[PDB]
């Protein structure tokens, strides 16, 4: 799980 613009995605 990585975070982009304060949101976590996979």
């Amino acid at each position: 799980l990585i975070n982009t613009n304060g949101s976590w995605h996979i």
Partner: antibody, heavy 118, light 110 residues
Framework: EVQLSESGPSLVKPSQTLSLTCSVTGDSITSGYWNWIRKFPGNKLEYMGYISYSGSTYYNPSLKSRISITRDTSKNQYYLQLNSVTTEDTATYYC????????????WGQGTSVTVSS | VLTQSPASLAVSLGQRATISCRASESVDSYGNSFMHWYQQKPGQPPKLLIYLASNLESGVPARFSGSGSRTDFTLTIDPVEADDAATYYCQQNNEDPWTFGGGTKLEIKR
């Protein structure tokens, strides 16, 4: 012993630029997320932003106009810059590490007081 | 937005303490709750107590406990000790913006 040490001026004149440095010893900023947080004198906490293991960044929206976070992995430091400060920006500033398994801020520095005044 | 309740609170040695964190919107995603708890005393940085809603940080006594739903969370100290006098903050990083709760100051009643 992951450990973080902030540094920078104690006193800044309004409309100048705030420049703080977090020096990290005890693991590498090659990995993990590296954040900036400030605590106002009323004792409220406010998240400011981070720079990640890959160099991407994320900033609080109430700051986007004037905040910049960068890093120097060979020194193992990363840096805050906040342009055009006012008295509202008087706070205790902390840097802190966040990591992948935990997704929470687990190592803090002691904090550095910064006053914006003429 | 995160609202804590109460803003102050008093507890005798050995009783149960319950601090509440209210969320404006669901902070769940990918099976975890992105909700954490921090203790802070004057002159010191915040200290992580509970990460991911219910997981105890190592180094922290088992007297501290965390438990929470998508938008309602709670922190529990049982039994409270003299050392537990501090201010407790909840923080959310599910989605933009990352924000802290207003804070809850715990007083030990003697």
């Amino acid at each position: 012993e992951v450990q973080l040490s902030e540094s920078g001026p104690s006193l800044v004149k309004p409309s100048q630029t705030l420049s703080l440095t977090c020096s990290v010893t005890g693991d590498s900023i090659t990995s993990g997320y590296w954040n900036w947080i400030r605590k106002f004198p009323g004792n409220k906490l406010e998240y400011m932003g981070y720079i990640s293991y890959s160099g991407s960044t994320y900033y609080n929206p109430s700051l986007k106009s004037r905040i910049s976070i960068t890093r120097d992995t060979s020194k193992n430091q990363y840096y805050l810059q906040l342009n055009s400060v006012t008295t509202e920006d008087t706070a205790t500033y902390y840097c802190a590490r966040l990591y992948d398994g935990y997704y929470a801020m687990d190592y803090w520095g002691q904090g550095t007081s910064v006053t914006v005044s003429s | 937005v995160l609202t804590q309740s109460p803003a102050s609170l008093a507890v005798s040695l050995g009783q149960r303490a319950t601090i509440s964190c209210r969320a404006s919107e669901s902070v769940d995603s990918y099976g975890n709750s992105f909700m954490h708890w921090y203790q802070q005393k004057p002159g010191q940085p915040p200290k992580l107590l509970i990460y991911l809603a219910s997981n105890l940080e190592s180094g922290v006594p088992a007297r501290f406990s965390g438990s929470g739903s998508r938008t309602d969370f709670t922190l529990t100290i049982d039994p409270v000790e003299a050392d537990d006098a501090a201010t407790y903050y909840c923080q959310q990083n599910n989605e933009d913006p990352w924000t802290f709760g207003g804070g809850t100051k715990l007083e030990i009643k003697r």
